Amino acid sequence: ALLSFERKYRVRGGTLIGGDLFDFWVGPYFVGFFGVSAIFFIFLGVSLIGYAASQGPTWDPFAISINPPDLKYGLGAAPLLEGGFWQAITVCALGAFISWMLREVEISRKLGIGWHVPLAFCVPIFMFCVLQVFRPLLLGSWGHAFPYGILSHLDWVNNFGYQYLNWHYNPGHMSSVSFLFVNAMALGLHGGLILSVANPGDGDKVKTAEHENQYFRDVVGYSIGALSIHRLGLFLASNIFLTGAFGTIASGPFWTRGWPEWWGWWLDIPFWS
Amino acid sequence: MYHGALAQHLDIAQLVWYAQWLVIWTVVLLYLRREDRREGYPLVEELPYPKTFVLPHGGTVTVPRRRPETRELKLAQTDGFEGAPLQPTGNPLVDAVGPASYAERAEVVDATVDGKAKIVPLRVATDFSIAEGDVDPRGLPVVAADGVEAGTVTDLWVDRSEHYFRYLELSVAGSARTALIPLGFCDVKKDKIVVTSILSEQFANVPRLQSRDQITLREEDKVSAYYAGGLLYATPERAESLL
Amino acid sequence: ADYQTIYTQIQARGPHITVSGEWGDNDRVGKPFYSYWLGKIGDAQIGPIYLGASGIAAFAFGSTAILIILFNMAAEVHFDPLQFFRQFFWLGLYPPKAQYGMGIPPLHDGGWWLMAGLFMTLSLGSWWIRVYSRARALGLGTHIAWNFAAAIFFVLCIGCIHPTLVGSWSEGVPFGIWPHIDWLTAFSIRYGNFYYCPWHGFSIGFAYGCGLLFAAHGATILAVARFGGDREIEQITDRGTAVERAALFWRWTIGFNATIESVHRWGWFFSLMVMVSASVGILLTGTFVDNWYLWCVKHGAAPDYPAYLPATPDPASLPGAPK
Amino acid sequence: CFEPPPATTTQTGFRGLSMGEVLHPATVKAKKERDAQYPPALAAVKAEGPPVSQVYKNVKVLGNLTEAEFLRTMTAITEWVSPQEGCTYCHDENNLASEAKYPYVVARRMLEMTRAINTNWTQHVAQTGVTCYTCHRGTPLPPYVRYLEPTLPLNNRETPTHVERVETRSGYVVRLAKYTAYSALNYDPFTMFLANDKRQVRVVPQTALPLVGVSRGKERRPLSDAYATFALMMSISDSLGTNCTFCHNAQTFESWGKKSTPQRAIAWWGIRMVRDLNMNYLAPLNASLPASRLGRQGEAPQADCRTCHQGVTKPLFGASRLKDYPELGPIK
Numbered sequence A: 001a002l003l004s005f006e007r008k009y010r011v012r013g014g015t016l017i018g019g020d021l022f023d024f025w026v027g028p029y030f031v032g033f034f035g036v037s038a039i040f041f042i043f044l045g046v047s048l049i050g051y052a053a054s055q056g057p058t059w060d061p062f063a064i065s066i067n068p069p070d071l072k073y074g075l076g077a078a079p080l081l082e083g084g085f086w087q088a089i090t091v092c093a094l095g096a097f098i099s100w101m102l103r104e105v106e107i108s109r110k111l112g113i114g115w116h117v118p119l120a121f122c123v124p125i126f127m128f129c130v131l132q133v134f135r136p137l138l139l140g141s142w143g144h145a146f147p148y149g150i151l152s153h154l155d156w157v158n159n160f161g162y163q164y165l166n167w168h169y170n171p172g173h174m175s176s177v178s179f180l181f182v183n184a185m186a187l188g189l190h191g192g193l194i195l196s197v198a199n200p201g202d203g204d205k206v207k208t209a210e211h212e213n214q215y216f217r218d219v220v221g222y223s224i225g226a227l228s229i230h231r232l233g234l235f236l237a238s239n240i241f242l243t244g245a246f247g248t249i250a251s252g253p254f255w256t257r258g259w260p261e262w263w264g265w266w267l268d269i270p271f272w273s
Numbered sequence B: 001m002y003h004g005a006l007a008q009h010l011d012i013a014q015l016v017w018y019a020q021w022l023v024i025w026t027v028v029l030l031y032l033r034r035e036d037r038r039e040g041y042p043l044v045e046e047l048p049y050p051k052t053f054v055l056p057h058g059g060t061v062t063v064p065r066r067r068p069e070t071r072e073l074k075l076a077q078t079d080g081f082e083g084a085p086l087q088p089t090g091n092p093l094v095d096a097v098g099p100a101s102y103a104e105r106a107e108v109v110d111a112t113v114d115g116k117a118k119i120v121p122l123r124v125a126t127d128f129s130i131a132e133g134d135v136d137p138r139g140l141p142v143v144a145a146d147g148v149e150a151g152t153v154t155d156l157w158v159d160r161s162e163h164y165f166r167y168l169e170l171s172v173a174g175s176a177r178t179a180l181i182p183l184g185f186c187d188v189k190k191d192k193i194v195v196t197s198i199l200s201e202q203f204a205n206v207p208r209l210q211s212r213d214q215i216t217l218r219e220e221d222k223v224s225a226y227y228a229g230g231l232l233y234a235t236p237e238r239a240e241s242l243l
Numbered sequence C: 001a002d003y004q005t006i007y008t009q010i011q012a013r014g015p016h017i018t019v020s021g022e023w024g025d026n027d028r029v030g031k032p033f034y035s036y037w038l039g040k041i042g043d044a045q046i047g048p049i050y051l052g053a054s055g056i057a058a059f060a061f062g063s064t065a066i067l068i069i070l071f072n073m074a075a076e077v078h079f080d081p082l083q084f085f086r087q088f089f090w091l092g093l094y095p096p097k098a099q100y101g102m103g104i105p106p107l108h109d110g111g112w113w114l115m116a117g118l119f120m121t122l123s124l125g126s127w128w129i130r131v132y133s134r135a136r137a138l139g140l141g142t143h144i145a146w147n148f149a150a151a152i153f154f155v156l157c158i159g160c161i162h163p164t165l166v167g168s169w170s171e172g173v174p175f176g177i178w179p180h181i182d183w184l185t186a187f188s189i190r191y192g193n194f195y196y197c198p199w200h201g202f203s204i205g206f207a208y209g210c211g212l213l214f215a216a217h218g219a220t221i222l223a224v225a226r227f228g229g230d231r232e233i234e235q236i237t238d239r240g241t242a243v244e245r246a247a248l249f250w251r252w253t254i255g256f257n258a259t260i261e262s263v264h265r266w267g268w269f270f271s272l273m274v275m276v277s278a279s280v281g282i283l284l285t286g287t288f289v290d291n292w293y294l295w296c297v298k299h300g301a302a303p304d305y306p307a308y309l310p311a312t313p314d315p316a317s318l319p320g321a322p323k
Numbered sequence D: 001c002f003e004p005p006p007a008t009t010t011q012t013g014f015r016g017l018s019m020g021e022v023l024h025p026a027t028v029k030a031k032k033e034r035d036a037q038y039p040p041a042l043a044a045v046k047a048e049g050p051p052v053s054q055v056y057k058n059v060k061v062l063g064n065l066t067e068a069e070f071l072r073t074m075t076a077i078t079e080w081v082s083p084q085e086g087c088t089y090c091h092d093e094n095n096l097a098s099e100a101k102y103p104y105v106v107a108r109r110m111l112e113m114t115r116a117i118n119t120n121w122t123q124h125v126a127q128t129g130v131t132c133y134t135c136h137r138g139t140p141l142p143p144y145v146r147y148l149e150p151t152l153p154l155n156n157r158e159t160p161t162h163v164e165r166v167e168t169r170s171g172y173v174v175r176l177a178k179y180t181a182y183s184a185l186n187y188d189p190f191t192m193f194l195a196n197d198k199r200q201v202r203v204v205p206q207t208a209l210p211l212v213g214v215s216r217g218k219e220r221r222p223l224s225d226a227y228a229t230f231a232l233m234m235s236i237s238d239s240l241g242t243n244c245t246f247c248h249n250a251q252t253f254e255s256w257g258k259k260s261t262p263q264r265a266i267a268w269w270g271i272r273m274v275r276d277l278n279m280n281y282l283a284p285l286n287a288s289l290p291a292s293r294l295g296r297q298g299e300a301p302q303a304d305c306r307t308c309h310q311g312v313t314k315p316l317f318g319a320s321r322l323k324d325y326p327e328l329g330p331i332k
């Protein structure tokens, strides 16, 4: 049930709220007050998806879709089968996300480590709010949000991008895309480096941290460092949504044309026009 | 006629879809998930055959480790439930339980690539120094969590393999000893080193080194774990609820 | 709070280390210098750098490709320095616009494009030798080289392999900021919406997956930097409490965990699968699939929606409609 | 750089597909005011009398009207075409039956073209229709015309800069860009798609698998056709002041039915109408117009979407003069 080095860490404490009341384990999982509330919102959310899906025309996983209301309903309540189910599932999703994050804070405190992981988990929760709450609020209706469906929510992303002619020219998009590329590149570089030092091949000796910095000083002339690549990788990954949140919330509230035309601030400067 | 069409209503891109799922789950479940089990297994209270590393400075190791000795835990179970938390039976900082726990690392000195001791104080690493513009902590007071001066910084321990300071050494006030503290537990100001992990009196029981001018891998674990245990155990309130 | 995870409070200086390789120690060039502000979030030493034959061949082949691109771009503005600096994002080198099949297109309609791509292919191959040989010279595994080769392979797929499989140099990627962007939409339109290519979704999941992994892994090592978690090579061969607490964080959160070594195998595998998935999708595109959306419609996977505005017949299908 | 909130948004597809218009009220307001300059209908006149085919000397199209009904149209045409030059823009002041001025012979062909649009192209103009004003907007040269090469600015009433001039070769890319909604697509979708009926706008297959005989080598259309279609669609979107979801469900651009809006079908008739107007009415006019009206290849000014729409999904937001001037169509 326990790892070979787990028992000495299985002490009480580190909780935010609840005290000893929920400070226990269920198998390998830790519970806490936020593990209870997480199961609460997940059960409530999965239930709502099931009841709404039974009312639909298909049980095919790729075809099921739970969509937001019509634009005319605005930010008010919507009929259960005409957007209400979407509204309740969204509330449950946020509850499960925020509970999952605070649960991670409690596990961090019991282990005596920093809160770096739950703080980083706030980034994808923040972007989810930009799409489903913040941008809908600025535009005036919940129907501007994406639907909950495996293949249907891709059509949302597709139409939304074309609503502004060529979404590729979105400057917040170009930044979000650049971080997505460089982060996946840096993870292959870094994961490959550590494995190259510990697995030199044949029956050779495991190399050193000196070998790490020497390889990348040879290839590119600079090595950022063992600890610094972990601060960098978290910075590159987080800025996929941090910079992308700008371009998404500007499409509509702050810009209604096609994104190629936005670049007229440069192209249309009078002295070289 | 169509390119890629096969028998029945089948086509080539359809076949590769099944092949792609098979390869992905084969790599995930039959390889990556078994490499995840090279530490902490087997469980107590599917496994890969052992992996053996040839160490850079002589000798080998095979993971996971089987230590010739094991420690006795000063912990008391809170209840008979299989997933009940444990409870310290004494001083958790010196007993090293919970966040104060350290691992049974090798009692060997971590070495540079050319065989020298990696973590050494600047009194030994005379070719090293602090960069121009940063605070030289030597001679500055160490202020603990209760606001009391715990001692005075005497040296910095540098990693000669990465050119990175990792500890401060301070004379413990009224104890005729020096203790090491990881720089992560130090808030370096211009006139003081702030340490909120433990109180001033708790600096007396920081694990001591066997040699004055070097440190082993297990001693580094013991020193780091003691301050981390203070995040939960320095005062009775840190083990309770925040709200 | 661990302030070291934010920046280096006290930077250390020392004699610069040189680890000898099997060959090429004499080909390292440059006097190292130290940036104070770079040292706060990384190592302060910049340089030296290794040259070598493959690294030199990469610069020669690569500068040739770039020079061919920039010259053709300067001609598009008739060698006006102001307009070139202005219109730079819009200028480009294009593949053949007419259909010559696999015949080497004229210089004014795709010839310069095919030649810059040849030199770019030689530049990438040269740089892979350097990435591969530097690991062998230092006694390291080729884990980075083989990840690099998958990215080079995907570039070959959209650059010449798929053009050869369908038999037209017109399907290749143009050189340029906006022009290579515009290719993405024409390539998705032509082949029936890339959102319905399963390997597109596979490559997207792995690309998102590298974002999740480096955020979780990077933050985890920062969280255990108080115990020297960044000293990972020696945490592999001699487990410390840093990666013990790290494994137990994830074991107590998601019910399982990896090792400090294997989490890198996950990260190296996810990054690799971004290119492997994208390549297989380009190789199937056009060769055996003409319309990915209808391909999903053929297999019943496409989602359908009720009519909001009334359905619209194809007017070209109407009786008596013009051609 | 950015446009303030709030924005006008409509819904053109099923909820959750993010289909619909995204408008800026300040832009729509300025266009609504500009299009409100449409002179109201002239008052009704006496319906009894001889036909001008009897009364007058050189009437060839409007011969069935009475004199009062015929001079009314002669006033509206002047209001719509040449209100500042007056009657003598097209007429010899001393003989109104003479064709001695080039605008006379062009205006008669335009009278025929106007009746043709309202009679033969109702699949598009419907009961709204077009008059002289729909394009001319009060000037003899319509503000939004095309030549056989890109030109800037789009509104010919604006003074061009040096680089905007078609003679300056260093600004060609910008002349191409602004006609395709500032994109870098390297194709002129007017001469390619709207000047005549030679090319096929549709480029996406209607088969799941590649059909044998059209899928390899020189059997294939070049992928340049996909860019060019994309270029026409950015020009169409800009000239109407709209986006794709006004017409397509971006799920499947090539599919109709529930994947297309009713406006996409009207747009399809609009493409066939532009080609008819350019090929059979506007292009042959280069033999009647003076050399100062022609393009660098001897071409007369020709029409695209923006000639009538001028940035609005409907010309003049749907304003109509059809019932007020039956002599302009539909023709029984």
Ligand code: BCL
Binding pocket: A097, A124, A125, A127, A128, A157, A158, A159, A160, A161, A162, A166, A167, A168, A170, A172, A173, A176, A177, A180, A240, A241, A243, A244, A245, A246, A247, A248, C184
């Ligand atoms: C025609 C369509 C457009 C287009 C339309 C859009 C639109 C529209 C948007 C993007 C956005 C993004 N685009 Mg795109 N995009 C296009 C082309 C591209 C290309 C390319 C090579 O061409 C790339 C690389 C990208 C890439 C990207 C991303 C980097 C970026 C952010 C994604 C995001 O917000 O995820 C969001 C992900 C989340 C919110 C996940 C949150 C997860 C939560 C916290 C946890 C979930 C737990 C789960 C329920 C648990 C289940 C239990 C199981 C046990 C696991 N796009 C084309 C041109 N793109 C966005 C952006 O930022 O734009 C500026 C955006 O809004």
Ligand code: BCL
Binding pocket: A046, A049, A128, A131, A146, A150, A151, A153, A154, A157, C195, C200, C201, C202, C204, C205, C206, C208, C209, C212
């Ligand atoms: C603005 C940008 C868009 C966007 C654009 C795209 C595009 C484009 C693609 C995806 C793809 C996917 N997206 Mg999406 N996606 C967005 C936001 C979300 C949200 C959310 C909480 O908002 C979720 C749950 C998802 C989930 C998913 C998966 C179904 C899939 C693979 C992702 C992946 O590997 O991630 C990294 C995470 C992991 C590798 C870990 C495992 C995660 C598992 C797979 C999550 C399963 C979720 C499943 C739907 C069940 C949900 C809960 C049920 C109630 C049980 N996306 C936003 C709205 N997404 C791709 C695909 O194939 O879709 C079918 C694809 O092509």
Ligand code: BCL
Binding pocket: A157, A181, C061, C062, C063, C065, C066, C119, C120, C123, C124, C151, C152, C154, C155, C158, C183, C184, C185, C187, C188, C193, C194, C195, C197, C199, C200, C203, C204, C207, C274, C277, C278, C279, C281, C282
């Ligand atoms: C309208 C536009 C289309 C679209 C069109 C395409 C097309 C077309 C392709 C992709 C592909 C990809 N798309 Mg896209 N895509 C869209 C929407 C999305 C969305 C989204 C949320 O909507 C997402 C997340 C993505 C994401 C992705 C990527 C994961 C994927 C792989 C490419 C990549 O990573 O390249 C980043 C990495 C590289 C380019 C590798 C580079 C490696 C080399 C070695 C670097 C050399 C550097 C050197 C200095 C260069 C010197 C040059 C000198 C001249 C010498 N797309 C929409 C639907 N997408 C590909 C794919 O998977 O197809 C199946 C693909 O071919």
Ligand SMILES: C/C=C1/c2cc3[nH]c4c(c3C)C(=O)[C@H](C(=O)OC)c4c3nc(cc4[nH]c(cc(n2)[C@@H]1C)c(C(C)=O)c4C)[C@@H](C)[C@@H]3CCC(=O)OC/C=C(\C)CCC[C@H](C)CCC[C@H](C)CCCC(C)C
Binding pocket: A038, A041, A042, A044, A045, A046, A089, A092, A093, A096, A097, A100, A117, A118, A120, A121, A123, A124, A147, A148, A149, A150, A151, A153, A237, A238, A239, A240, A241, C208, C209, C211, C212, C213, C215, C216, C253, C254
């Ligand atoms: C920029 C930084 C990023 C990043 C980072 C990090 N990511 C983290 C952490 C960090 C740091 C963690 O520590 C945490 C974790 O422990 O990981 C193992 C986590 C996790 N990242 C998940 C998914 C994930 N991350 C994505 C995005 C990024 N992550 C980007 C890249 C995407 C994308 C792109 O789609 C996905 C799918 C889960 C696996 C996990 C949360 C589980 C949860 O919260 O459980 C609690 C909730 C549930 C078990 C389900 C609740 C169901 C609701 C009620 C009903 C369904 C609603 C739903 C909207 C329906 C959708 C339909 C669908 C078709 C639209």
Ligand SMILES: CC(C)=CCC/C(C)=C/CC/C(C)=C/CC/C(C)=C/CC/C(C)=C/CC/C(C)=C/CC/C(C)=C/CC1=C(C)C(=O)c2ccccc2C1=O
Binding pocket: A026, A029, A030, A031, A035, A036, A038, A039, C212, C213, C216, C217, C218, C220, C221, C243, C246, C247, C250, C251, C253, C254, C255, C256, C257, C258, C259, C260, C263, C266
């Ligand atoms: C039964 C019941 C109701 C119990 C109540 C208690 C309770 C709260 C139970 C939770 C139940 C729930 C919701 C379980 C679902 C948990 C989830 C979301 C599982 C998703 C798993 C997935 C797909 C993760 C994606 C990321 C991924 C592919 C990880 C594989 C590799 C791993 C394990 C990375 C994690 C990992 C990282 C990132 C390190 O850095 C590290 C460093 C040193 C040692 C180990 C590690 C390590 O394991």
Ligand code: HEC
Binding pocket: D056, D057, D058, D059, D060, D061, D062, D063, D071, D074, D075, D077, D078, D079, D081, D082, D086, D087, D088, D089, D090, D091, D096, D097, D103, D104, D105, D106, D107, D108, D109, D111
């Ligand atoms: C822009 C074009 C235009 C304008 C403005 C214009 N004319 Fe006309 N006019 C024509 C054309 C063309 C015809 C021949 C139409 C036909 O054959 O039915 C014509 C025919 C006539 C005739 C018939 C004479 C004959 O015997 O053939 C009269 C009278 C006339 N116009 C009067 C007027 C008046 C009155 C005005 C202004 C108040 C005016 N014109 C301004 C173009 C114009």
Ligand code: HEC
Binding pocket: A165, A166, C189, C316, D200, D201, D202, D203, D204, D205, D229, D230, D233, D234, D236, D237, D240, D242, D243, D244, D246, D247, D248, D253, D254, D255, D263, D264, D265, D267, D268
């Ligand atoms: C007002 C009308 C309208 C607008 C706006 C519009 N479309 Fe089109 N589009 C059409 C019509 C009609 C066709 C069919 C052309 C034909 O039948 O000859 C078409 C054709 C297409 C095609 C090719 C269809 C095929 O079978 O090959 C694509 C792709 C496309 N449009 C995408 C777009 C894009 C991209 C945009 C904007 C950026 C856009 N549409 C905006 C009306 C429109």
Ligand code: HEC
Binding pocket: D117, D124, D125, D126, D128, D129, D130, D236, D240, D263, D264, D266, D267, D268, D270, D271, D273, D274, D303, D304, D305, D306, D307, D308, D309, D313, D314, D315, D318
């Ligand atoms: C010479 C006249 C003319 C030209 C050229 C023209 N339009 Fe139209 N169009 C009209 C008129 C008039 C209407 C008003 C029809 C109505 O009220 O329903 C209209 C209506 C439309 C509509 C319907 C909008 C709605 O809200 O119902 C679309 C879509 C459209 N045009 C697209 C196009 C396209 C596509 C082209 C060219 C390729 C084009 N227009 C060029 C005259 C024109």
Ligand SMILES: CC(C)=CCC/C(C)=C/C=C\C(C)=C\C=C\C(C)=C\C=C/C=C(C)/C=C/C=C(\C)CC/C=C(\C)CCCC(C)C
Binding pocket: C066, C069, C070, C114, C116, C117, C118, C120, C121, C155, C156, C158, C159, C160, C172, C173, C174, C175, C176, C177, C180
């Ligand atoms: C000043 C400094 C430091 C750097 C300058 C960089 C610079 C300004 C470059 C100039 C303009 C820019 C930014 C251009 C950007 C171009 C981009 C983004 C291109 C992106 C993709 C292009 C691709 C993938 C092209 C691939 C082409 C190929 C793989 C061709 C393969 C060719 C062959 C196999 C030839 C064999 C056939 C034989 C019979 C001829």
Ligand SMILES: [Fe+2]
Binding pocket: A190, A194, C221, C232, C264
């Ligand atoms: Fe790492």
